[PDB]
Scaffold this active site. Sequence first.
Site, PDB file in Angstrom:
ATOM      1  N   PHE C 216      -2.942  -5.577 -25.888  1.00  0.00           N
ATOM      2  CA  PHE C 216      -3.522  -4.525 -25.070  1.00  0.00           C
ATOM      3  C   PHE C 216      -4.296  -3.591 -25.995  1.00  0.00           C
ATOM      4  O   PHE C 216      -3.708  -2.905 -26.836  1.00  0.00           O
ATOM      5  CB  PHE C 216      -2.398  -3.776 -24.358  1.00  0.00           C
ATOM      6  CG  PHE C 216      -2.864  -2.835 -23.275  1.00  0.00           C
ATOM      7  CD1 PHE C 216      -3.393  -1.589 -23.593  1.00  0.00           C
ATOM      8  CD2 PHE C 216      -2.725  -3.180 -21.937  1.00  0.00           C
ATOM      9  CE1 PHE C 216      -3.801  -0.710 -22.589  1.00  0.00           C
ATOM     10  CE2 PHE C 216      -3.134  -2.311 -20.928  1.00  0.00           C
ATOM     11  CZ  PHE C 216      -3.666  -1.071 -21.255  1.00  0.00           C
ATOM     12  N   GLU C 251       4.864  -8.039 -23.901  1.00  0.00           N
ATOM     13  CA  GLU C 251       5.277  -8.650 -25.172  1.00  0.00           C
ATOM     14  C   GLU C 251       5.421  -7.607 -26.284  1.00  0.00           C
ATOM     15  O   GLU C 251       4.459  -6.878 -26.585  1.00  0.00           O
ATOM     16  CB  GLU C 251       4.279  -9.731 -25.627  1.00  0.00           C
ATOM     17  CG  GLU C 251       4.702 -10.429 -26.937  1.00  0.00           C
ATOM     18  CD  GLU C 251       3.793 -11.595 -27.358  1.00  0.00           C
ATOM     19  OE1 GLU C 251       2.779 -11.873 -26.672  1.00  0.00           O
ATOM     20  OE2 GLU C 251       4.104 -12.242 -28.388  1.00  0.00           O
TER      21      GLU C 251
END
Lengths: 366, 38, 316
Positions: C216, C251
């Site tokens: 991200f 994650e």
Amino acid sequence: PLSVDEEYDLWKSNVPLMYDFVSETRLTWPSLTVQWLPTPVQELDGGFIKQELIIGTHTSGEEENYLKFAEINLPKEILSPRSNIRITAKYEHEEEITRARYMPQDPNIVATINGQGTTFLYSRSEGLQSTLKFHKDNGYALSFSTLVKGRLLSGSDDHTVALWEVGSGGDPTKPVRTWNDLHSDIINDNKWHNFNKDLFGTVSEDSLLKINDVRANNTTIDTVKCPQPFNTLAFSHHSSNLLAAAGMDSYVYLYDLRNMKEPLHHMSGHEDAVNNLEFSTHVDGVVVSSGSDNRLMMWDLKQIGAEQTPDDAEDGVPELIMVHAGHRSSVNDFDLNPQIPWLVASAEEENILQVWKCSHSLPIVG
Amino acid sequence: GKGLGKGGAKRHRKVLRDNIQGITKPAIRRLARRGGVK
Amino acid sequence: DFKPETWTSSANEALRVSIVGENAVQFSPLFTYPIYGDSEKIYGYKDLIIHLAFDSVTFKPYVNVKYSAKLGDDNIVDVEKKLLSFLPKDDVIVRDEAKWVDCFAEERKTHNLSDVFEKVSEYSLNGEEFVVYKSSLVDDFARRMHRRVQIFSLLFIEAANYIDETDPSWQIYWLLNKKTKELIGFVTTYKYWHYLGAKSFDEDIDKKFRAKISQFLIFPPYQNKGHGSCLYEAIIQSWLEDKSITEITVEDPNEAFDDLRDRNDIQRLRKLGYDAVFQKHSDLSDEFLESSRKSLKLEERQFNRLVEMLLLLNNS
Ligand SMILES: CC(C)(COP(=O)(O)OP(=O)(O)OC[C@H]1O[C@@H](n2cnc3c(N)ncnc32)[C@H](O)[C@@H]1OP(=O)(O)O)[C@@H](O)C(=O)NCCC(=O)NCCS
């Protein structure tokens, strides 16, 4: 870079923390096969709990081979330490026993297949009953139906599969159906579905997995191209659509019978070929695998894709519950005890049989 | 590394353990997954 | 004076990362260790400067390595070749700045992500419009772009790895300035099969998934303006609408992502009226809590943290 023996010693040091129980036994000859009988738990004098196990020999032509029945007398806490083990019956066997399976609807009967692909039926109470000759080469595939009494499937290195019906009366020594057309190479495994009495699956060195119907003229309803050959497959005991298959590429794959076009998922952990697979009869979603990396691994499909902390992810994918590293050579076979959840028997290439149960503190046993 | 985007090595392994709490219950879980051979 | 120590430099300082739009915005990487080794040091170059630059729209990459002097040596690392190995083959311009500008001028004429990709949502921020797009990684155009921006994962996310672009379960979200077409950031996401037990699995033929945020990234020039929150909310909202998705997961999130996630999740909960629900004495049957978490598509650990927080926050 620990040697096999240094790693074993490390494993041994951690056994009291990781296991409720471990028994280790050196057999005089290796067993290629392991299966718990469905004998109900019974406490004996002295507080031991009796269970029974089927094993075999592989003498490499040096001595007589034997089908053997062992009484495993476990410590009572195994239900919530040491065991007595007693060989209660030995029956002469022609060549090595590659697989030995009891008949679910009559566990006095045990089927075997050998290094020449000959199938035999043994009675616990009376010894060898019948010789079922079709396959001409070593066979590793052998499976009794839990749904039709005496319905038996065998498969061989000679590429062939046979269906036998040995549970009715009459003569059971001739197959009721044979297939020369399912696979073009060694049959690694064949297994019955757990809900559809007519469905079975086969895997072969030809890199195909097939889903088959015994009634159909054309037989095969689905054909799957395997990334590399699968050595084994297993069907769920809870879902009528779920199965697992695994082999050379080391991954355990999951499939949906309704859509075999692609795997649901594959689980990583094994560092070499996977050779055996079983679904738990006790917990929906639990799968156990063994392989040529000397390991057995227990998996929880309900944790596939679960979120992990970074330290947690370092030890493996979330679906990995536990690794059994007690063996010092490739695992020949293993079996989950159907009466005692989490009790396992596993045998390795170099003559060791281990009987073990993971820690009850593991969240999965609850 | 199925679907992994952060499965690479860290810069350095850490020296202080936030898990000196071993021989506890979650410690069993980690041990089991490591197969007791880490 | 002789300063041979100046022939050893911090890789994080020597590497100048530039995003070039109306102006060249220059900044440092957080990590270089997967490129230049664990000590993140470079030896054998005096006054070393490594330019890694990208067009603000197409992210067409440029590399130029400069130094006052260098140890002719074979043990000495080829700094340029090293960096190029983490960049798309034959898609990087080297040294020739004018050639680089000519290249992305021509590209800017061609199509935007916004012409090819599927649109997800829009939002306004700082008196400006932004659009979130998503795509697969099998698309040739999506691959070309993702190969260009990939290295930012290595330079700004600890332990990042390059993902498998052949794996069709990868989905990428792209954050764009709507008018200028500049790429503000991107998010790589994945889907894992979610087994809900035999009964549920046998009853619906439609495959169910846990959706996972992996990498991200909002580019450094654009951080601390709310983009992270808006983008996270845009993605979560599209996942809430997606019938195939049961849970939202992340994650190995860091502390900064932890706080962003928590702030947005809480705000979503309050908006849905969960302040009134999570009280010490509210009827909270086990099946209602189950039903609640599934409605919310919240991961189980995150869900429990959130409820505990709300109990403590509105009490106290
Ligand atoms: C996070 C990132 C996206 C910036 O986007 P952003 O939405 O503007 O986020 P912000 O930093 O401005 O944080 C929002 C602000 O709201 C404010 N805020 C309001 N209420 C708050 C509260 N209850 N708690 C804390 N902050 C609050 C704060 O100012 C907060 O800033 P802070 O928490 O950093 O101190 C960017 O840092 C990034 O991409 N970094 C590198 C990539 C990375 O590491 N990704 C995670 C690993 S995959």
